[PDB]
Amino acid sequence: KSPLTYAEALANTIMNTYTVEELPPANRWHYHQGVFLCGVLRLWEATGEKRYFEYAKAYADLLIDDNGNLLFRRDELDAIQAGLILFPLYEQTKDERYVKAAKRLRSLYGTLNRTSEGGFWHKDGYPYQMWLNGLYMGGPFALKYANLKQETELFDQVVLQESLMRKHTKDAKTGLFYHAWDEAKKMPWANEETGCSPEFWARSIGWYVMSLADMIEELPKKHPNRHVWKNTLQDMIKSICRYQDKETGLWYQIVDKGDRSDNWLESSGSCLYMYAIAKGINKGYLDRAYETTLLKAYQGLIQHKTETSEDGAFLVKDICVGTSAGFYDYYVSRERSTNDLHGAGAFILAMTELEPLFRSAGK
Ligand SMILES: C[C@@H]1O[C@@H](O)[C@H](O[C@H]2OC(C(=O)O)=C[C@H](O)[C@H]2O)[C@H](O)[C@H]1O
């Protein structure tokens, strides 16, 4: 029941399930594998087991050639996320192929379309729409690159993107942030007055809090946002925990509507909150009192969402598949999948930040 034990169990199950050539979407550079591999590389640093490092490197090498060339969806913030695996790979090998690949992804920022205030469109196919998920897809990578190449322009970039998102999607009443915002107000889900989508979808908010929790330490010392983001995170975590499931300790697909019978407890979102809370506590951004909420979620997660198959495979169920911006009925109707990379990555990542607290609990 130690966090890392489950993390390795799930990691090995996924790796045994897919060769790096099969890791879905097969032979594509995408954030599905990106988040899972970020988890795998984090587990590597925590255990020192070379095969976690080698598996991640295998996927990178399948897509990045001898000259650092990489094929990717050029209009999506989503394409940048996997770039996060390039930093630990480069730091360990010093192979310039990874820095060259990272530069191709970093060069995308200047080619992307933006809203009138400068917020990146989530994709070319989603004109003038900012989705919370985008903060994680393009934020952390930008800061990691900023520190690697001493390009301060990227600090301002992330600060702007984050402020624009919070400004347009944060709900005063609940403290939760709406999934998406359409400056053009052309999408059917765009509120005629605010331009926001109608629901608080767990994972989207989860991507946001994990981002804040990880990006604070990347900012230069004394940076104005070290305090802005810490405070934003405290308020969001406070808001989020107000909706934790009293019985299971988990969170619902649609955060603020757990009473509805068509709603349900979703795994990846819960894990992302667990990660942000654990991370926040370890870095001193959140009151250590949150440890109980965290350990309660861990208990419910393992108890209600995990099991081992007759064959010995560790399974995490109720992970929502890739999802777009929409209405309530669309969100609750999303396919629930077992070991979907969205959830596997979130699960493993959460276990790596949880472990430390788990071992110092009571001290
Ligand atoms: C190409 C597919 O586009 C969407 O269906 C999904 O990606 C979106 O949803 C999510 C998510 O966390 O569910 C994250 C991305 O930021 C967003 O673009 C699929 O995952 C994509 O494969």
Curated annotation (Swiss-Prot):
Keywords: Cytoplasm, Glycosidase, Hydrolase. Pfam families: Glyco_hydro_88. It comes from the Bacteria. One of its GO terms (cellular component) is cytoplasm. Optimum temperature is 50 degrees Celsius. It is stable below 50 degrees Celsius. Substrate binds at residues 30-31, 78, 122-126, 203-207, 323-324. Its EC number is 3.2.1.172. It catalyses: 2-O-(4-deoxy-beta-L-threo-hex-4-enopyranuronosyl)-alpha-L-rhamnose + H2O = 5-dehydro-4-deoxy-D-glucuronate + L-rhamnopyranose. GO terms for biological process: carbohydrate metabolic process. The active site is at N133 (proton donor). Optimum pH is 4.0. The record marks Y31, D78 as: May be essential to modulate pKa of the D-143 carboxyl group. Coiled coil: none annotated. Its main location: cytoplasm. One of its GO terms (molecular function) is unsaturated rhamnogalacturonyl hydrolase activity. It is found in: Cytoplasm. Belongs to the glycosyl hydrolase 105 family. Monomer. Catalyzes the hydrolysis of unsaturated rhamnogalacturonan disaccharide to yield unsaturated D-galacturonic acid and L-rhamnose. It cannot act on unsaturated glucuronyl hydrolase (UGL) substrates containing unsaturated D-glucuronic acid at the non-reducing terminus, although the active pockets of YesR and UGL are very similar. This is Unsaturated rhamnogalacturonyl hydrolase YteR. The gene is yteR.
